[PDB]
Amino acid sequence: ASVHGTTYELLRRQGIDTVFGNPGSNELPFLKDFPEDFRYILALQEACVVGIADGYAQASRKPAFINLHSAAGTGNAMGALSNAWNSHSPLIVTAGQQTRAMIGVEALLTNVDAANLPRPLVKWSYEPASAAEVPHAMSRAIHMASMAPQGPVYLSVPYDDWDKDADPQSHHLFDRHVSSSVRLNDQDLDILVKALNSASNPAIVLGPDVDAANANADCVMLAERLKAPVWVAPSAPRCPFPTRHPCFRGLMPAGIAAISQLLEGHDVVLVIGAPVFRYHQYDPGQYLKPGTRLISVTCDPLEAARAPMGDAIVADIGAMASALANLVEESSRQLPTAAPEPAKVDQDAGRLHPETVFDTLNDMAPENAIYLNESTSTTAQMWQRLNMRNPGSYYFCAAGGEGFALPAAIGVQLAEPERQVIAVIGDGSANYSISALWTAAQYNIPTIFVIMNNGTYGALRWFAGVLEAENVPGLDVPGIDFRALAKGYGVQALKADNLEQLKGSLQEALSAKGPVLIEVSTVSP
């Protein structure tokens, strides 16, 4: 068998059937004779390729396979890799290298010192020492991406390797099963459960690895048994809990002092599937107030090591959430009372307040919609106003890197063809990965893109306020016609300058058979 045949067999035997790519000449010997059971999803720029693959992997809860061109293609994707690293996204990033005979002379398209290029944003990065090693290196890449804590990995392959003979012993790779589905030993798990059972006023904080593990329902059972309020850890990349469940208390503020004040009076705080904590603004004070102790369950040793307070347990989130939910006692405390609905903000017949947009989306969207957020100044209102009952209903760029939501929304929609995806993206953020729209048009992936157009980088005006920073250039982005950009890439486009038009546009978009972009005129901050 050839290295080409052996590698595609390994991929299919490991459950991979889709290649997200932007091709180049170092990759043509891999992509030739493309197998009939695989599909190739083309995107026009590599940040878009990786963003699409990332949304697909996060929604599918399985690894996604990417093929990029050498150093330039890899490099164009590295902002997308920064988000994937923070979201623990299982991405297998492959890039083609020059033929082995010209690597030394650094022919055009040689990826020099290739394995160092995507570091430090990958769990594993490698170029094989021979063609016959390629399938074994691909096997390492698959398992490295997929083991807890999941994350992106990188493999560089010289183009001449594909046609070489494979090692006949490579067949032992095909059906390897690797598990990291582990939980704390019985004795120490019993100690933890007793501490939870004994707590007088517990609180629960959930992060994105809960939603990645589909541990959401087990966390609902846990919160109901402990009769405990539940918050989502700050800077949330996913939604790990039903947002109208009576225990839900919302998104935590991303500040040290704000979090310790919120948790004051809670004697035990159990954090599951989150870093402790992804603070953002610098809000110095106590990490925890006297009387509060913290216990973190994380799938990532790096998170356990860097927490500034608390105990930690490094284990699989799915296995731990299931075990805790089934072992804790039902507390005799009263179940927390649901938060009140948000107030309606006053809205005239002009430009839309973001609150009006989210209320209207909540009114009109299906109950199993999936939302993506890259509307950076409106995140708090979004979390208050969208009822997200189901797992996999929310994505936000995990490293704060713009250019995620537009392509990721296409990958999520590909992963979840029966759930309507609605990406809410600011006019600034929309530009970073604008060409991803073409992939939605070409493959008819029916994502709805809602562009919140207020003419400015609004969140940067906010942070400038926090810092008291004046005379800052580069904050305004006037003069972008998003309906023309959508037309440019073949996507149907609508404009909403007021509430009547927003409702009409959403009705049309929800009825459409393909992707739709709605440009919404929102109020300037």
Ligand X SMILES: Cc1ncc(Cn2c(C)c(CCOP(=O)(O)OP(=O)(O)O)sc2=O)c(N)n1
Record the tokens describing residue 341, joined without a space. 């609905």
Rounded CA gap, 314 and 182, in Å? 9
User: 419-438 mask for Ca ion (x: CB under 5 A)?
Assistant: -------xxx----------
- In terms of CB distance, is 392 or 428 closer to a copy of itself? 428
Residue choice 407, 411, 428, 515 for contact with ligand X (CB under 6 A): 428
46 is catalytic: yes
CB proximity list for 120: less than 8 A, separation 6 or greater: none
**44 lies in the binding site for ligand X (CB under 6 A):** no
Nearest distance in Å: CB 481, Ca ion: 15
Nearest distance in Å: CB 116, Na ion: 5
User: Exposed, middle or buried by CB within 10 Å (0-12, 13-18, 19+), for 445?
Assistant: buried
Distance (Å) of CA 196 to CA 191, 200, 293, 398: 9, 9, 11, 30
CB proximity list for 471: less than 8 A, separation 6 or greater: none
Instruction: Please work out, in degrees rounded to the nearest 5, the angle formed at the alpha carbon of residue 35 by the alpha carbons of 34 and 38.
Output: 100
**31 lies in the binding site for a copy of itself (CB under 8 A):** yes
Record the tokens describing residue 18, joined without a space. 């889709």
Rounded CA gap, 421 and 371, in Å? 6
**244 lies in the binding site for Na ion (CB under 5 A):** no
Nearest distance in Å: CB 455, ligand X: 8
Distance (Å) of CA 192 to CA 48, 188, 223: 43, 6, 15
Nearest distance in Å: CB 167, ligand X: 27
Rounded CA gap, 62 and 59, in Å? 8
Record the tokens describing residue 307, joined without a space. 């927490």
User: 137-156 mask for a copy of itself (x: CB under 8 A)?
Assistant: x-xx--xx--xx--------
Annotated binding site: 116-117, 119, 427, 454, 456
Nearest distance in Å: CB 194, a copy of itself: 15
Rounded CA gap, 477 and 90, in Å? 34
CB proximity list for 98: less than 8 A, separation 6 or greater: 26, 70, 107, 109, 110, 111, 158, 159
- Which residue in 24, 255, 392, 411 is the catalytic one? 24
Binding to a copy of itself (CB under 8 A): which residues in 464-483? Answer: 464, 467, 469-475, 477-482
- In terms of CB distance, is 39 or 119 closer to Na ion? 119
Beta strand pairing status for 153-158 and 311-314?
unpaired
**345 lies in the binding site for a copy of itself (CB under 8 A):** no
230-254 per-residue burial string, b: 16 or more CB within 10 A, e: under 16: bbbbbbbbbbbbbbebebbbbbbbb
- Which residue in 400, 455, 488, 514 is the catalytic one? 400
**230 lies in the binding site for a copy of itself (CB under 8 A):** no
List the single partner that 130 binds among Ca ion, ligand X, a copy of itself, none, CB under 5 to 8 Å by kind: a copy of itself
250 is catalytic: no
Q: Are 114 and 435 in contact (CB under 8 A)?
A: no
401 is catalytic: no
Residue choice 457, 494, 502, 516 for contact with ligand X (CB under 6 A): 457
3-state secondary structure of 289: coil
Rounded CA gap, 225 and 221, in Å? 6
User: 172-191 mask for a copy of itself (x: CB under 8 A)?
Assistant: xx--xxxxxxxxxx--x---
**119 lies in the binding site for Na ion (CB under 5 A):** yes
Binding to ligand X (CB under 6 A): which residues in 18-37? Answer: 22, 24-25
User: 73-102 mask for ligand X (x: CB under 6 A)?
Assistant: x--x--x-----------------------
Q: Are 525 and 461 in contact (CB under 8 A)?
A: yes
**376 lies in the binding site for ligand X (CB under 6 A):** yes
27 is catalytic: yes
Distance (Å) of CA 7 to CA 46, 53, 158, 171, 484: 23, 20, 14, 10, 42
Binding to a copy of itself (CB under 8 A): which residues in 109-128? Answer: 109, 112-113, 115-117, 119-121, 124, 127-128
24 is catalytic: yes
Nearest distance in Å: CB 456, a copy of itself: 11
User: Exposed, middle or buried by CB within 10 Å (0-12, 13-18, 19+), for 189?
Assistant: middle
**378 lies in the binding site for ligand X (CB under 6 A):** yes
Binding to a copy of itself (CB under 8 A): which residues in 431-450? Answer: 431-435, 438, 441-442
- In terms of CB distance, is 44 or 258 closer to ligand X? 44
Binding site for ligand X (CB under 6 A): 22, 24-25, 69, 72-73, 76, 79, 374-378, 400-403, 426-429, 432, 454, 456-460
Catalytic residues: 24-25, 27, 46, 69, 280, 400
Binding site for Ca ion (CB under 5 A): 36, 426-428, 454, 458
